Design a protein around this ligand. Structure first.
Ligand SMILES: Oc1c(Cl)cc(-c2cc(Cl)c(O)c(Cl)c2)cc1Cl
Ligand SMILES: Oc1c(Cl)cc(-c2cc(Cl)c(O)c(Cl)c2)cc1Cl
Lengths: 115, 112, 112, 115
């Protein structure tokens, strides 16, 4: 599991369940190609997006579909989605945890990078 | 005015208005003595808490009554209040707080 | 000026100065077209990006070049940049970003 | 484990290891009495502070000793510590995760409350 996403809801003090996450990788022609996608579990975690073999060096974008999440709760939020863009594995394989904390008008994101 | 407080609401995307703020300074006996207080304005700001003369080096606590704020909006919050504790050293302090029911963040902007 | 950007540095407790910001609007073909840009001032602020006439309803992206900022301070950052994507609907927008090497937070303050 | 603390470092993108945490409970005479204390592990987590039996209703304060953490890294930080104060178990036992994300001039805290 070299790439894991964890999403929390700051309004309810709970994991953010069933949030859609789409991951893209920047291709040789500077286009974002689809890489992986999934939905957060009841623990607000998304595991198994990729493998070490497939997760090569590159620029990745993790798009978290926050708008759909808040709308399904009857809240009209500010952002369309939360986007996290980073270079990965540029000095060898690392494990990446991307965490996001969500509110209707704000969000925070962090990365925990281990090896 | 060397100390300013700004409070924002992350749920509504607005200044947090009418939020009570109490400032304390740590006394000789390790007690917190009341120092300054007020309620944030329409812009979520609290200006004029103190003066350069009075704002001597020391340890200060800024207590933001976040519970009352959320209760007024009909939302059940987690925290009793938010506290920011820091040392003022000489060499302007903006204490900002961003509020959600189960989370808050605070940052200090120290300028000049 | 219906759109303002403010950027703060959580490592140094200061405005984030000289940070390039690019604003894009989503075009008819789902493309991002350049809309406005600038560099934050000494107060970490970027004013005068647009006018009420030009700032029509639509989807906008604000891209903050956080990587260059951290590189200038000799700190290796995680993110390529920070992006804030939102719909402007009619019924002033302050987009604030708080920057650390491996983390950032952004909040919108929508007033009037 | 009804009370867990997790602390992350936003400067290094790593868990915050060896951070001291002191927990207090408000006593009948409105004094803060010591309740539990510990240090975060290599994963930035602190488990085993208390038991369900001991963790009764009350107002608790979780003090995270952030100043010592940053000083040991050669950074002179703004805050003396981060404090999280909350009523616990007021409608029955809950499990509380207190998370903090740390930077020298800022911090964020969240609670995940489950049952
Ligand atoms: O003027 C300000 C505006 Cl607009 C926002 C913040 C601010 C404060 C905190 Cl804590 C945040 O997490 C974010 Cl994202 C912005 C601070 C100042 Cl000083
Ligand atoms: O397990 C975790 C828990 Cl509980 C909380 C956060 C987490 C994530 C964000 Cl964005 C935060 O601002 C804070 Cl304070 C904690 C991260 C992980 Cl990985």
């Amino acid at each position: 599991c070299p790439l894991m996403v964890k999403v929390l809801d700051a309004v309810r003090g709970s994991p953010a369940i069933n949030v859609a996450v789409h991951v893209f990788r920047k291709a040789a022609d500077d286009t974002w190609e689809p890489f992986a996608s999934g939905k957060t579990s009841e623990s607000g975690e998304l595991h198994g997006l990729t493998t070490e073999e497939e997760f090569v060096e590159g620029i990745y974008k993790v798009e978290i579909d926050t708008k759909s999440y808040w709308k399904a709760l009857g809240i009209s939020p500010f952002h369309e989605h939360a986007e996290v863009v980073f270079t990965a594995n540029d000095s060898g394989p690392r494990r990446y945890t991307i965490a996001a904390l969500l509110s209707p008008y704000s969000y925070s994101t962090t990365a925990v990078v281990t090896n």
